[PDB]
Amino acid sequence: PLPDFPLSRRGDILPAEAERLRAEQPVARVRTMTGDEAWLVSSYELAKQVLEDDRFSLKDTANPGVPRQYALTIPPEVVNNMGNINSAGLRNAVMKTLSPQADRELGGWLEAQAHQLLDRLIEQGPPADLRDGFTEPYSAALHCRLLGIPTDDWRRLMSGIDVAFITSPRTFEGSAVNWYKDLGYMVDRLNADPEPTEGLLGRFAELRRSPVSDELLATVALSLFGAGAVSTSAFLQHAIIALAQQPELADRLRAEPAVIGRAVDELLRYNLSIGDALPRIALADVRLGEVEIRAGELVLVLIEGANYDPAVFPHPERIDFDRESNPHLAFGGGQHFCPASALGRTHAEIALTALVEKLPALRLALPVEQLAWRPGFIKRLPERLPVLW
Amino acid sequence: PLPDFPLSRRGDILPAEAERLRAEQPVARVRTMTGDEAWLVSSYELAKQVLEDDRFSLKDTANPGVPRQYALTIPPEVVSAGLRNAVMKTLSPQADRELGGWLEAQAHQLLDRLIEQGPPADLRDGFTEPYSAALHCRLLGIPTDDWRRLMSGIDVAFITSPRTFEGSAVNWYKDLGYMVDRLNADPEPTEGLLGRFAELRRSVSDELLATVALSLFGAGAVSTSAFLQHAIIALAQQPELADRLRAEPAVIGRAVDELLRYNLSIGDALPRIALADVRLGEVEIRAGELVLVLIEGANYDPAVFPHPERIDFDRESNPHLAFGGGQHFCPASALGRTHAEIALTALVEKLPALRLALPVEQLAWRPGFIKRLPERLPVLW
Ligand code: HEM
Ligand code: HEM
Numbered sequence: 001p002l003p004d005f006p007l008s009r010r011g012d013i014l015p016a017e018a019e020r021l022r023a024e025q026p027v028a029r030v031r032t033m034t035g036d037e038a039w040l041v042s043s044y045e046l047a048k049q050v051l052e053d054d055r056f057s058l059k060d061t062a063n064p065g066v067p068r069q070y071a072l073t074i075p076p077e078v079v080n081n082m083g084n085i086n087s088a089g090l091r092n093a094v095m096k097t098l099s100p101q102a103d104r105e106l107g108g109w110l111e112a113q114a115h116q117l118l119d120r121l122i123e124q125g126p127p128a129d130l131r132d133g134f135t136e137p138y139s140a141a142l143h144c145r146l147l148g149i150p151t152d153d154w155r156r157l158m159s160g161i162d163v164a165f166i167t168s169p170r171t172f173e174g175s176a177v178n179w180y181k182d183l184g185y186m187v188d189r190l191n192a193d194p195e196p197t198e199g200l201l202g203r204f205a206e207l208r209r210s211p212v213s214d215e216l217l218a219t220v221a222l223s224l225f226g227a228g229a230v231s232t233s234a235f236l237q238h239a240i241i242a243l244a245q246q247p248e249l250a251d252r253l254r255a256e257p258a259v260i261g262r263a264v265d266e267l268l269r270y271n272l273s274i275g276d277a278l279p280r281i282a283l284a285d286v287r288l289g290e291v292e293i294r295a296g297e298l299v300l301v302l303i304e305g306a307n308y309d310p311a312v313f314p315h316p317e318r319i320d321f322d323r324e325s326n327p328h329l330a331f332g333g334g335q336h337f338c339p340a341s342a343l344g345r346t347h348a349e350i351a352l353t354a355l356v357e358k359l360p361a362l363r364l365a366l367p368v369e370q371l372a373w374r375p376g377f378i379k380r381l382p383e384r385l386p387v388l389w
Numbered sequence: 390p391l392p393d394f395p396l397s398r399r400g401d402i403l404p405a406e407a408e409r410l411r412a413e414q415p416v417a418r419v420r421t422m423t424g425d426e427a428w429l430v431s432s433y434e435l436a437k438q439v440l441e442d443d444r445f446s447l448k449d450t451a452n453p454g455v456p457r458q459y460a461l462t463i464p465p466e467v468v469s470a471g472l473r474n475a476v477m478k479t480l481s482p483q484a485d486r487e488l489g490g491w492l493e494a495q496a497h498q499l500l501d502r503l504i505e506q507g508p509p510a511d512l513r514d515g516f517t518e519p520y521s522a523a524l525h526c527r528l529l530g531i532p533t534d535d536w537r538r539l540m541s542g543i544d545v546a547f548i549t550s551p552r553t554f555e556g557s558a559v560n561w562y563k564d565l566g567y568m569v570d571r572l573n574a575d576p577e578p579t580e581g582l583l584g585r586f587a588e589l590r591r592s593v594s595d596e597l598l599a600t601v602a603l604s605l606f607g608a609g610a611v612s613t614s615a616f617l618q619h620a621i622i623a624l625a626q627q628p629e630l631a632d633r634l635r636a637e638p639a640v641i642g643r644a645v646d647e648l649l650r651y652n653l654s655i656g657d658a659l660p661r662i663a664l665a666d667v668r669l670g671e672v673e674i675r676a677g678e679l680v681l682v683l684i685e686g687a688n689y690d691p692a693v694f695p696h697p698e699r700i701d702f703d704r705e706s707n708p709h710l711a712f713g714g715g716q717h718f719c720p721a722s723a724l725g726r727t728h729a730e731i732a733l734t735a736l737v738e739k740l741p742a743l744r745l746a747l748p749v750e751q752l753a754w755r756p757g758f759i760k761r762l763p764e765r766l767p768v769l770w
């Protein structure tokens with residue numbers, strides 16, 4: 001009887017199953033939701049090894065006929081987004097866009113967005129949903145600025161993410177319809193009569209007049225927006241649950257705002273926003289711990305396994321803003337380490353700073369056990385994050 | 390070990406458990422989510438009997454000390470004042486006249502928006518919620534501009550919790566305050582229940598007025614939106630029903646009536662306190678015990694409805710309990726039906742290739758709510 005993957009949808013405590021797997025079979029054979037078999041790696045040491053060993057391929061997880069943890073919801077070519085981006089001389093436009101340094105006003109503008117969104121929830125009074133009222137509009141607004149598009153249609157863009165990022169046992173119609181719908185949005189914004197200045201679409205319009213089709217440009221835009229928005233909103237929601245359940249943390253923040261950096265780094269270690277594992281196909285037979293992994297097999301990295309490993313993190317179950325060291329995997333590791341890590345931090349640091357200043361009596365409106373955790377999604381997240389203040 | 394209540398939040402099929410319960414113990418001792426016990430009544434004969442007998446009270450369900458299927462969220466005096474005329478005149482679709490053509494303009498505008506974006510769309514946030522909110526804002530004579538906020542209030546108000554939670558009261562007072570201010574607007578409200586209430590305290594506190602307004606807005610928007618999502622699933626999964634409605638638009642009344650019998654929007658049971666020792670089938674219910682009517686139990690009862698598991702827009706007869714029965718039979722039934730007839734008519738006209746964007750098995754069913762509903766209702770056309 002293989003343990004079933006994925007683990008619990010509930011994102012406010014580490015699933016007891018992640019603790020058991022890391023302790024008894026840090027490389028366990030598991031059955032994914034497709035019915036394919038996989039190697040789930042749940043210890044820090046072995047997770048870092050997989051991430052840092054190039055014979056475990058990310059690109060190759062989209063190949064036809066390989067074992068899948070769930071259906072492809074995007075074209076095969078996009079699962080190697082950083083690959084293709086690098087190979088087209090597009091890396092510079094993308095890397096300038098992802099660099100927080102490269103946009104001197106980003107900080108002040110993110111800060112202003114966070115303040116106005118919370119000011120709107122304070123105008124109506126508690127309770128409010130901090131997902132629909134804060135994390136979603138805030139993450140959408142960041143990513144509209146990164147692309148250089150307006151914010152008018154954020155709701156329909158974030159609805160695109162509600163479909164794009166579904167984990168299904170089999171392909172579903174409408175995963176592709178969804179992809180081509182918002183690809184179309186990105187192509188229209190890029191080929192606008194007042195041609196787009198500002199953003200990655202600004203840099204893309206500059207770039208296709210030098211000596212890369214419209215479809216690949218739109219593809220990069222759409223794939224960066226959905227990856228960034230889904231990841232930032234989900235992380236921020238779990239960071240918000242941490243501050244609501246542990247108000248001592250929001251007190252430290254208010255008392256000592258400069259510790260927000262180290263604080264977000266700990267919330268990143270602790271956050272359970274990743275609803276699945278980082279996938280790789282073995283390109284060769286590899287001895288990983290006590291298991292022989294055959295070429296062509298699927299390897300699944302359990303970030304929450306590694307980031308809660310008591311071998312590396314003392315008292316891993318307890319949030320601690322004063323860790324001497326924090327070599328966490330929340331951004332992954334090796335060659336596919338998140339290229340937007342600095343931007344992820346800046347996003348969270350600013351939203352969290354604004355929130356503890358604007359809602360100093362922030363708490364869940366109801367017991368944490370009664371939050372609705374989203375099923376069948378790449379991220380764990382509360383469908384609604386009702387709070388009081 | 391007692392069977393657990395409530396049953397599955399899955400709303401696309403009748404829970405197997407409801408079938409086993411109706412078959413083997415149609416009056417069943419269950420543990421509610423509060424850990425209290427109750428009698429779950431799952432056959433039509435006994436469901437109909439509890440609803441039509443006044444030895445079972447709904448008002449007493451809110452009394453202190455009684456067993457509960459879940460915690461109160463609203464004040465106890467809301468589960469005599471000569472308002473009955475203002476309220477009943479509002480719940481009459483034939484006192485707003487333009488309602489029909491207005492709701493139809495609403496449905497079409499909401500749908501025209503999604504057709505412009507192109508599929509997929511979420512028919513909950515893009516259709517049922519804006520549409521249901523629109524109805525109830527017109528009912529109260531208030532603008533529709535704060536519909537997201539108002540429907541968010543419903544997301545907290547209609548939670549099923551084992552124990553009470555803060556926020557239930559905060560949420561209640563936040564929106565009471567909202568209704569009190571629309572009641573007391575400088576250009577006094579004219580039109581709607583508020584309009585009528587304004588004229589009816591010139592002839593009952595502002596507290597009580599906004600309290601009726603808010604409970605009415607609450608119960609109707611949550612109920613019409615949830616039912617319309619089930620009817621939409623029915624028409625997506627069974628596109629022959631949508632072909633029927635395009636071919637024969639006049640059957641929408643019979644059709645919406647069968648979709649009512651079939652729908653699993655009601656996610657709890659209709660609660661009664663026994664005001665006395667009453668025998669029900671083979672069970673001696675003692676005074677002050679909680680009785681719970683499982684509507685999907687009665688509406689799928691084959692002793693009354695042939696082939697209950699199948700939707701038939703052509704049944705000779707359809708005496709369904711979707712609106713309840715006896716003294717507490719839904720007072721807004723016709724408004725309920727009108728809401729759904731006009732949205733579904735508009736839906737099968739505008740989106741004739743309507744289908745789910747994925748297998749119905751993979752919809753997210755909302756937990757811990759009075760309604761069974763899909764958190765999202767993603768569709769293609
Ligand atoms: C708190 C926020 C974020 C978290 C927790 C996060 C986490 C991660 C992780 C763990 C990976 C590695 C995937 C793997 O190894 O298979 C990754 C990669 C990636 N992330 Fe992030 N991410 C965040 C924000 C963002 C943002 C804002 C963007 C873009 C706007 C972004 C775009 C990407 C891209 C393009 C990759 C793929 C890189 C490659 O394959 O080489 N991320 N992210
Ligand atoms: C199609 C949607 C609707 C369905 C499925 C529905 C269902 C029901 C049911 C089953 C009851 C009986 C309660 C019980 O016996 O415990 C009820 C009662 C009630 N409904 Fe409707 N309802 C709908 C529409 C509405 C609307 C539009 C309104 C008003 C705006 C409304 C307001 C009420 C009120 C006030 C009661 C309580 C009556 C009493 O206690 O005597 N409902 N509803």
Ligand SMILES: O=C1N[C@@H](Cc2c[nH]c3ccccc23)C(=O)N[C@H]1Cc1c[nH]c2ccccc12
Nearest residue numbers: 073074078079081082164165223226227231378
């Ligand atoms: O840029 C990418 N790089 C990798 C890894 C990755 C980066 N950020 C993520 C966030 C969630 C899951 C995977 C990733 C990938 O696999 N695809 C895309 C992102 C993406 C856009 N829409 C999607 C729908 C479905 C799955 C992935 C994507």
Ligand SMILES: Nc1ncnc2[nH]cnc12
Nearest residue numbers: 274275276277278279378
């Ligand atoms: N595969 C993945 N699952 C969840 N979150 C991610 N962030 C980046 N890649 C991811």
Ligand SMILES: Nc1ncnc2[nH]cnc12
Nearest residue numbers: 612655656657658659759
């Ligand atoms: N008890 C109840 N549960 C669900 N929906 C209702 N509509 C009216 N009363 C209801």
